[PDB]
Write a protein that binds this ligand. Structure first.
Ligand code: CLA
Ligand code: CLA
Ligand code: CLA
Ligand code: CLA
Ligand code: CLA
Ligand code: CLA
Ligand code: CLA
Ligand code: CLA
Ligand SMILES: CCCCCCCCCCCCCCCC(=O)OC[C@H](COP(=O)(O)OC[C@@H](O)CO)OC(=O)CCCCCCCCCCCCCCC
Ligand SMILES: CC1=C(/C=C/C(C)=C/C=C/C(C)=C/C=C/C=C(C)/C=C/C=C(C)/C=C/C2=C(C)CCCC2(C)C)C(C)(C)CCC1
Ligand code: SF4
Ligand code: SF4
Ligand code: SF4
Ligand SMILES: [Cl-]
Lengths: 81, 751, 72, 141, 73, 143, 68, 73
């Protein structure tokens, strides 16, 4: 199920999305496309709820991290019951 | 270094800073200075709206609790200045633009009027003939009645009151300036809650009613006794002539012959000439007895002055509020009130929530008390004045209550410390808020089904031609048995459980039908199945408003959906479309929904009041005594169905507002249409969303770019929270203005 | 549905879910589908559906009844 | 993963805690070492007391554990950056979740494989008509 | 005359909503990739200023009110 | 010869006369109703006696919509032109936004005064390039 | 070929400033995908709802700019 | 009843027509094959269309409401 979280090559490696994410969906991995030498990654999208905090945080001209809401699970619906 | 007085510490708990904030006009020319985010510069039009949204948010402006307290103190001064200007304008318009003396000479055959419209573009039709050749707008504030009760006779006295009100406003304004800029009290000064409370109970409330009892005994009561006997206002001596001639006071009240000796020697009984306890209403004017009110204010002065001693300040005797709080803790509540004294002395929003709740409740109490115990002369004759004051105090109370919920939520977000609240009342309520809110939800559903559901059942039964299956006094009766029993107990109180009371506290509980002039002042108000149903509707709507607002407060920190909501703030749109969508989780949004539901509740309350008073109370009495009510006692059979409320209440009584054109009440029909318009207008903001409007602004901005007229402050659609604020503000304004026009036109047209 | 948006209802439904899971006798029964608040788009659509049904039925009853009682 | 240790925080109980899901579906655990007995905000409402030494707490959701973790690492005098978050299944199986490779994700780390990476801008996604009657959206290709 | 201009206002505003929705359904500046999100979706979150009722489906939903208003008139 | 046969001049309508002999005073002048009964008599009324206006374009009713149209369009052109020139001038003052919220009263009054020649300045900016900007030099959204 | 203070028009279709012009602030060293840092007078939409302003800087590749 | 019936049906049909035009643009529109034709040229100047629809709606609304309110007062 889960949502989809894509990271595009306009990433500047500021990591603000990872710090904003309240469910630990994102990581920083080494890259060579930007000065910061790091790119955001979404290795745990099965826990992603889709609150869009990462997108709120992204500074690049139109987001370099994009959350497309998809199939809804109890983890993705933020359910505690 | 402005004007520096000596000291004035009086060896007290006073502690001020001599001159913390200097006076200057430069920050006037820099709009947005109080917020760091706005002092930079407006790049989008959002900056503009924010400039108004955070003006009084002193917490987000500075972190010094002392500076916030000083700001609040000086703003209180400025607010009292505004209210003094308003009241002085009221007295000035009564002095130089009202028919108060002509009304005083013949109150029955004239209508209270102030404010003369200037004859232009045809608006001169609004100067309707109120009596004695006077043409103007009829006022429903009831200022003339308060003035006759006070003992006013000449316009020059009202003009002196207006001049004094302007001077008092200047005093409050200067005091605010002086106490924020020059001598600014330290934080330690505001935290003397025992001192403040002793003073407010003793000096503010007690001495106030003491001085007003003095004025009523010396000025109000004798002038009103001479007016009720018909001595005419031109022949009654000035108020001071009773102080200069104690024989004139003894001739009206022989008790004044014995002097102050009955007071000092506890011989109070001889004071029966002006300190009375009759209970009912004045036969000549329909208001309360001014001697009863003087004795009342006297006893209230006594009680409040005495109460102003419980708390401890500098002299050892008294009470420590922290001690009384910490003492109260039981087996169900862990540590009870341990920590409440600390939050009620360092958090402004806590005091504000408590005070807003109690003040709104008190204003509702004031409406419900002033309608049935009319305290002013000739008030009950004027059904417009009565209805207007009732609905006004209702709305004020409801708004204050919604604000109370708001600031409870704000406290929870901003000033809540879990270390200072461990296993106390607040902690345990947060620990079982799920239980609380789920049960309140169930009670709300039970009330909706068992109040409005009764109306739906009755509509369906009557439509099917099955009146015997309806809920009504003539079928399946739902008698308000307990309220009827309490009414009966009230009726039997004088002479029995109230020996020294001559009459009942309020004739709405039962008894004779007190009637002044051709109209009925007050008579018993029977209660039946329709009253049962309306009262349980009231219960339902009040419980739903409480559910919304209490849920807003209890979950402002967190929920199972949003566990870190406290970090998001009191006021924020959402936390994303994720988790299924999290729109309106903030405390602010709960206030936003509670606004609509309080509007719903109070609309029903005032509709109930208007219809019940027009059906079973107000009317014309005959020389034989026959009572023909305004709408012929139609409440019992019509107010039990929704179609009855739509036809016999709304549709029927709307006939005056719609036919008001070409007459003095035409502005009421105009404002009727205007309120409908603004209500409809609000639905655009409430039903839509910011994204569409911003995208449309994109094309409009492109058209501006095409002709090079694009503004540097980029147009941005209203923020989500602002969209809702605009929506709710216009919804409330439109609906309330509609019913304001409806009520005023209907009540002024029925004579 | 149009005015009041979704998160407030999801929190209320969570209180109701807790109320059910802790009420004995009712605890014998459990939902096959987890109760949740209506989605955002679903809310818009359901609110519009009520708006339109009420719109059409109100005006139809008015038109028909007025023209029939008056007979043109 | 193995067994989890730690003392439950001093707490009298709330209505906001675990429900039937915890036993029927899944649960989450957060462990942390504290320097003293200190009060902290319970993500399910109320104030609790963490103990000196090890503390294990069971919560209903991963986001609740992560909110508690941010509170631990941001609101305490000596900051607590020691908390570990696990997913607990009713079979007794425990799954280590956070922080993944022993290092917080905000900072880069070697041995991490990029996922969700797209070697183009947003504006370089294909047109939906070019992919209709597949099952994919322009971000999935 | 007056009701015919009310009718013209209603037709034009309903057409404006529907046409703005259709022409911005592929993308705008708030959502330059909106075609990747389909005709109907909840929103784009509270970021970038806030994006309530961003989809073209929302434009349909808003236009329905104006159609009903026009037909009322 | 027989145009607008469903209307008759207000001086010939009996309903208009019966209503105008009771016209209400508009200001403090007690002859404003008579002034109305005099002035409105020249236009076309109808069965109800209320004057009807003809925006058809014929000059016999040039005062019904043509003259007011000219007046309004002049005033609105003045307003928009002076506001636009104020905006353009301010744009190159290093901080245009602050001067948009805090008005530059000297420049503002100066631009307002020079607004009586706004159609001439409009034509002059059209013939140059100050009025209309080129599309490829304007921001647009994706298609 | 782009130097500091060059006025360049934006050619990125999804860019907020497509069709708008910005000044070049710096050109980062080679090896980077989008080196040209551009500052704009007009802020974009960046920010949480209710925020005062937004971002006025972004990185681009040279072929995504047009020299003015 | 028949007039009201058919007019309401017409309103629903019109709204649905524009809604499915939007759905076309979202799901089926091809820019390369429709390149430079009238269909694509409608998107090319979409800001002009939307802005002039806004202007005609504002024109009509302002002035029809103004005449109505003048007559009412
Ligand atoms: C010549 C008089 C004067 C001068 C120049 C100043 C100067 C200043 N005051 Mg001060 N003050 C004054 C009178 C004055 N005050 C009075 C009479 C009061 C009592 C209410 C106060 C109480 C006070 C407080 C509590 C605070 C200030 C603050 C400030 C500074 C912020 C600038 C500002 O106010 O923004 C511009 C303000 C305006 C343009 C005012 C517009 C009108 C407002 C919006 C509502 C008017 C209500 C009115 C005051 C009530 C009575 C009116 C009634 C009679 C009709 C500033 C340097 C603030 C500060 O410290 O800055 C951080 C602050 O917190 N003053
Ligand atoms: C308590 C609030 C209050 C309210 C709402 C009113 C309301 C009203 N008053 Mg009153 N009045 C008040 C207080 C108030 N007054 C006070 C305190 C005094 C004693 C000073 C007076 C003395 C007074 C007089 C002598 C008169 C009124 C008049 C009026 C009416 C016309 C107002 C007008 O056009 O002024 C004129 C306003 C302007 C020319 C524009 C104001 C300039 C703006 C604010 C500048 C803004 C740009 C910078 C109006 C309904 C008139 C009336 O009743 O007509 C018969 C009139 O004769 N008032
Ligand atoms: C008996 C002493 C006394 C009295 C009369 C008051 C009265 C008042 N206080 Mg105060 N207070 C006191 C002691 C007193 N306080 C002490 C000791 C403290 C320290 C703990 C405080 C700290 C405190 C705070 C923090 C605040 C108040 C505020 C207020 C006002 C709010 C109530 C109101 O609006 O009602 C109606 C208002 C009026 C009727 C105004 C007329 C009263 C005038 C201004 C004073 C009376 C004149 C003087 C006594 C002489 C006249 C009487 C004499 C001729 C017989 C009010 C006028 C609030 C405020 O600032 O309001 C602006 C506020 O924020 N008080
Ligand atoms: C703030 C309230 C207030 C104020 C300012 C006053 C003020 C006054 N009262 Mg009053 N009074 C009050 C409360 C107040 N009283 C209350 C609560 C009661 C009810 C117990 C009375 C009942 C009362 C009586 C019975 C008398 C006064 C009298 C007087 C006057 C004293 C003259 C005198 O004693 O010479 C001596 C008078 C004679 C020898 C005769 C004086 C101006 C006296 C008076 O004559 O009033 C003018 C008088 O006898 N008062
Ligand atoms: C269920 C308990 C309860 C209830 C029913 C109330 C209800 C009420 N309180 Mg109270 N309060 C409580 C608990 C409660 N309080 C406790 C435990 C404390 C001890 C901390 C206080 C101390 C407190 C004070 C000091 C005052 C009140 C006042 C009031 C009345 C305000 C009416 C109003 O707003 O009109 C208009 C408002 C006024 C006429 C006066 C306003 C006084 C200021 C503006 C508010 C208090 C300022 C605050 C103490 C500042 C310090 C807090 C922090 C910054 C350190 C109201 C009926 C006020 C009052 O007048 O009492 C009669 C007031 O003076 N409360
Ligand atoms: C003693 C009462 C009291 C006190 C002092 C406060 C104090 C405060 N409130 Mg509160 N509140 C109150 C009553 C009170 N409120 C009531 C009665 C309600 C219910 C409506 C609320 C609900 C509430 C909310 C929802 C919020 C606050 C907020 C705030 C803070 C910001 C002030 C502000 O709004 O900025 C400046 C004030 C304005 C911009 C008001 C102008 C807009 C008004 C509503 C238009 C009304 C129009 C008019 C009445 C009628 C129409 C006429 C028109 C055509 C001219 C501030 C510390 C805000 C906050 O952030 O808290 C920290 C906020 O979110 N309050
Ligand atoms: C007429 C309009 C309307 C109606 C009927 C409702 C209905 C309801 N609202 Mg609501 N609301 C409205 C307008 C309305 N709202 C608007 C405009 C807003 C925006 C401000 C809100 C926002 C709002 C909030 C924030 C909340 C509510 C709440 C509630 C519920 C209260 C509980 C209750 O009354 O028990 C049930 C009553 C009913 C269901 C009414 C209908 C009952 C009929 C008479 C019986 C029907 C018989 C049978 C079932 C028919 C079946 C047909 C068959 C073919 C199957 C209730 C279901 C509160 C709540 O949830 O309380 C628990 C709450 O929190 N409303
Ligand atoms: C009676 C309710 C109402 C009103 C007045 C409006 C008004 C408007 N809508 Mg709207 N709408 C409504 C309900 C309403 N809507 C509802 C319920 C929905 C569904 C949610 C929508 C959804 C909607 C959409 C999606 C769109 C509109 C559009 C428009 C604008 C069309 C242009 C026009 O009418 O000409 C001119 C405008 C008017 C006549 C209205 C302004 C009237 C005021 C009184 C003029 C005078 C200004 C006033 C004096 C300001 C001073 C305030 C001060 C006194 C406090 C217009 C401003 C379209 C648009 O934006 O047009 C470009 C558009 O896209 N509406
Ligand atoms: C007609 C009235 C119908 C209500 C009668 C049944 C009461 C319902 C709840 C029973 C317990 C509450 C009464 C004891 C009051 C009481 O305080 O009991 C005692 C106990 C706490 O008392 P303590 O021993 O802690 O006292 C020390 C205090 O200082 C605590 O700070 O309360 C509780 O156990 C918590 C539950 C109370 C919350 C229950 C309220 C539920 C809302 C119901 C509303 C009914 C409407 C009433 C009309 C006005
Ligand atoms: C007058 C007259 C006449 C004439 C007529 C005419 C000529 C007309 C026409 C008319 C017309 C001409 C009309 C129209 C209408 C239109 C419309 C109604 C539209 C539309 C569209 C839509 C709705 C949609 C679209 C779309 C989109 C959105 C995108 C994609 C594509 C499509 C298409 C899908 C005659 C001589 C004969 C006779 C006498 C009279
Ligand atoms: S949408 Fe929310 S949960 Fe998903 S990756 Fe972004 S911040 Fe994390
Ligand atoms: S916020 Fe955006 S630019 Fe920054 S690291 Fe995350 S994806 Fe990259
Ligand atoms: S629709 Fe608006 S309020 Fe709702 S989640 Fe989306 S952005 Fe937030
Ligand atoms: Cl009925």
């Amino acid at each position: 199920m889960s949502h989809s979280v894509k990271i595009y090559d306009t990433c500047i490696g500021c990591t603000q999305c990872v710090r904003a994410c309240p469910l630990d969906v994102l990581e920083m991995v080494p890259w060579d496309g930007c000065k910061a030498a790091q790119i955001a990654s979404s290795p745990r999208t099965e826990d992603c709820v889709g609150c869009k905090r990462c997108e709120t945080a992204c500074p690049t001209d139109f987001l370099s991290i994009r959350v497309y809401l998809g199939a809804e699970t109890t983890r993705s619906m933020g359910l505690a019951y | 270094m402005t004007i520096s007085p000596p000291e004035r510490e009086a060896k007290a708990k006073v502690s001020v800073d001599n001159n913390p904030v200097p006076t200057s006009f430069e920050k006037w020319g820099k709009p947005g200075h109080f917020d760091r985010t706005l002092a930079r510069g407006p790049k989008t039009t959002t900056w503009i709206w924010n400039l108004h949204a955070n003006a009084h948010d002193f917490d987000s402006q500075t972190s010094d609790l002392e500076d916030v307290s000083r700001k609040i103190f000086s703003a209180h001064f400025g607010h009292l200045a505004v209210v003094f200007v308003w009241l002085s304008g009221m007295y000035f318009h009564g002095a130089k633009f009202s028919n108060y003396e002509g009304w005083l000479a013949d109150p029955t055959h004239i209508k209270p009027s102030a404010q003369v419209v200037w004859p232009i573009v045809g608006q001169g039709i609004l100067n309707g003939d109120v009596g004695g050749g006077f043409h103007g707008i009829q006022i429903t504030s009831g200022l003339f009645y308060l003035w006759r009760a006070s003992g006013f006779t000449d316009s020059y006295q009202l003009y002196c009151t207006a001049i004094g009100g302007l001077v008092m406003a200047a005093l409050m304004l200067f005091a605010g300036w002086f106490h924020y800029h020059v001598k600014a009290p330290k934080l330690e000064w505001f935290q003397n809650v025992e001192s403040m409370m002793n003073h407010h109970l003793a000096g503010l409330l007690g001495l106030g009613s003491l001085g007003w009892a003095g004025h009523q005994i010396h000025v109000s009561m004798p002038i009103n006794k001479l007016l009720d006997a018909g001595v005419a206002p031109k022949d009654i001596p000035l108020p001071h002539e009773f102080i200069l001639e104690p024989s004139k006071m003894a001739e009206l009240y022989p008790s004044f012959a014995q002097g102050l000796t009955p007071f000092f020697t506890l011989n109070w009984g001889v004071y029966s000439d002006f300190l009375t306890f009759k209970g009912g209403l004045n036969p000549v004017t329909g208001g309360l007895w001014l001697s009863d009110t003087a004795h009342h204010h006297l006893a209230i002065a006594v009680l409040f002055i005495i109460a102003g001693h419980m708390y401890r300040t500098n002299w050892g005797i008294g009470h420590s509020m922290k001690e009384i709080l910490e003492a109260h803790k039981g087996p169900f509540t862990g540590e009870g009130h341990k920590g409440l004294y600390e939050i009620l002395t360092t958090s402004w929003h806590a005091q504000l929530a408590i005070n807003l709740a109690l003040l709104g409740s008190l204003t509702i109490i004031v409406a419900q008390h002033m309608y049935a115990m009319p305290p002013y002369p000739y008030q009950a004759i004027d059904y417009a004045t009565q209805l207007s004051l009732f609905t006004h105090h209702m709305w004020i109370g409801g708004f204050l209550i919604v604000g109370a919920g708001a600031h409870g939520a704000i406290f929870m977000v901003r000033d809540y410390d879990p270390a200072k609240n461990v296993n106390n009342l607040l902690d345990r309520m947060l620990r079982h808020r799920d239980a609380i809110i789920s049960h309140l939800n169930w009670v709300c559903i039970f009330l909706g089904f068992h109040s409005f559901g009764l109306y739906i059942h009755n509509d369906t039964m009557r439509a099917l031609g099955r009146p015997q299956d309806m809920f009504s006094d003539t079928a399946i009766q739902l008698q308000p048995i307990f309220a009827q029993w309490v009414q009966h107990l009230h009726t039997l109180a004088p002479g029995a459980t109230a020996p020294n009371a001559l009459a009942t506290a309020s004739y709405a509980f039962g008894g004779e039908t007190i009637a002044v002039a051709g109209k009925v002042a007050m008579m018993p108000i029977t209660l039946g199945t329709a009253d049962f149903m309306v009262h349980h509707i009231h219960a339902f709507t009040i419980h739903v408003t409480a559910l919304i607002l209490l849920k807003g407060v209890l979950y402002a920190r967190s929920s199972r959906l949003v566990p870190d909501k406290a970090n998001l703030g009191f006021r924020f749109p959402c936390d994303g479309p994720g988790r299924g969508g999290t729109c309106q989780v903030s405390g602010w949004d709960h206030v936003f929904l509670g606004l609509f539901w309080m509007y719903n509740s109070l609309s029903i309350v005032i509709f109930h009041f208007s219809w019940k008073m027009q059906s079973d109370v107000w009317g014309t009495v005959s020389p034989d005594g026959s009572v023909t009510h305004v709408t012929l006692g139609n409440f019992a059979q019509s107010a039990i169905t929704i179609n009855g409320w739509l036809r016999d209440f709304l549709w029927a009584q709307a006939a005056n507002v719609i036919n008001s054109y070409g007459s003095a009440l035409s502005a009421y029909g105009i404002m009727f249409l205007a309120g409908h318009f603004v209500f409809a207008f609000s639905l655009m903001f409430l039903f839509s969303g910011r994204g569409y409007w911003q995208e449309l602004i994109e094309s409009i901005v492109w058209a501006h770019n095409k002709l090079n007229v694009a503004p540097a402050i980029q147009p941005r659609a209203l923020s989500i929270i602002q969209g809702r604020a605009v929506g709710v503000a216009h919804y409330l304004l439109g609906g309330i203005v509609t019913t304001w026009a409806f009520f005023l036109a209907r009540s002024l047209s029925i004579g | 549905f149009l005015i009041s948006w979704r998160g407030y209802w999801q929190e209320l439904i969570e209180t109701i879910v807790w109320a059910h899971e802790r009420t004995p006798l009712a605890n014998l029964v459990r939902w096959k589908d987890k109760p949740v608040a209506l989605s955002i788009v679903q809310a818009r659509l359901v609110g519009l559906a009520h708006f339109t049904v009420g719109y059409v039925l109100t005006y139809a009853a008015f038109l028909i009844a007025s023209t029939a009682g008056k007979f043109g | 993963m193995t067994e989890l240790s730690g003392q439950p925080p001093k707490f009298g109980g709330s209505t906001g805690g675990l429900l039937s899901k915890a036993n029927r579906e899944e649960k989450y655990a957060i462990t942390w070492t504290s320097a003293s007995e200190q009060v902290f905000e319970m993500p399910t409402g109320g104030a609790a007391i963490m103990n000196e030494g090890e503390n294990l707490l069971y919560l209903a959701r991963k986001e609740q554990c992560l909110a508690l973790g941010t509170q631990l690492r941001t609101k305490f005098k000596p900051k607590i950056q020691d908390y570990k978050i696990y997913r607990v299944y009713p079979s007794g199986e425990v799954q280590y979740l956070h922080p993944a490779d022993g290092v917080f994700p905000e900072k880069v780390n070697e041995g991490r494989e990029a996922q969700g990476t797209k070697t183009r801008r947003i504006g370089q996604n294909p047109e939906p008509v070019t992919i209709k009657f597949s099952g994919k959206a322009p971000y999935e290709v | 005359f007056l009701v015919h201009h009310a009718i013209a206002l209603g037709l034009h505003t309903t057409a404006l909503i529907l046409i703005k929705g259709a022409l911005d359904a592929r993308g705008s500046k708030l959502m330059p990739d909106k075609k990747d999100f389909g005709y109907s979706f909840p929103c784009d979150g509270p970021g970038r200023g806030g994006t309530c009722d961003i989809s073209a489906w929302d434009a349909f939903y808003l236009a329905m009110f104006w159609m009903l208003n026009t037909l009322g008139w | 010869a027989d145009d607008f046969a469903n209307l008759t001049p207000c001086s010939e309508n009996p309903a208009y006369l019966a209503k105008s002999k009771n016209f209400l005073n508009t200001t403090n002048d007690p002859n404003s109703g008579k002034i109305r009964a005099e002035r409105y008599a020249s236009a076309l009324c109808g069965p109800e006696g209320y004057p009807h206006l003809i925006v058809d374009g014929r000059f016999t009713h040039a005062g019904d919509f043509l003259i007011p149209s000219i007046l309004f369009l002049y005033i609105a052109g003045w307003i928009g032109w002076v506001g636009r020139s104020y905006l353009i001038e301010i744009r190159e003052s290093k901080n245009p936004e602050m001067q948009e919220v805090v008005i530059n009263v000297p420049l503002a009054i100066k631009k307002m005064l020079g607004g009586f020649l706004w159609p001439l300045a409009a034509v002059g900016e059209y013939t140059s390039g100050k009025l209309v900007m080129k599309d490829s030099e304007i921001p647009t959204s994706p298609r | 070929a782009l130097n500091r203070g060059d006025k360049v028009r934006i050619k990125r279709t999804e860019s907020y400033w497509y069709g708008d012009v910005g000044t070049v602030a710096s050109v980062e060293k080679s090896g980077i995908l989008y080196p040209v840092i551009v500052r704009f007078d007009r802020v974009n939409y960046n920010g949480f709802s209710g925020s005062a302003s937004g971002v006025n800087t972004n990185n681009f590749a040279e072929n995504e700019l047009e020299l003015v | 009843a028949l007039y009201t019936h058919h007019q309401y049906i017409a309103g629903f049909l019109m709204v649905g027509a524009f809604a499915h035009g939007a759905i076309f643009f979202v799901r089926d529109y091809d820019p390369v094959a429709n390149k430079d034709n009238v269909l694509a040229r409608m998107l090319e100047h979409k800001e002009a269309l939307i802005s002039h629809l806004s202007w005609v709606s504002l024109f009509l609304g302002f002035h029809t409401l103004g005449l109505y309110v003048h007559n009412d007062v």
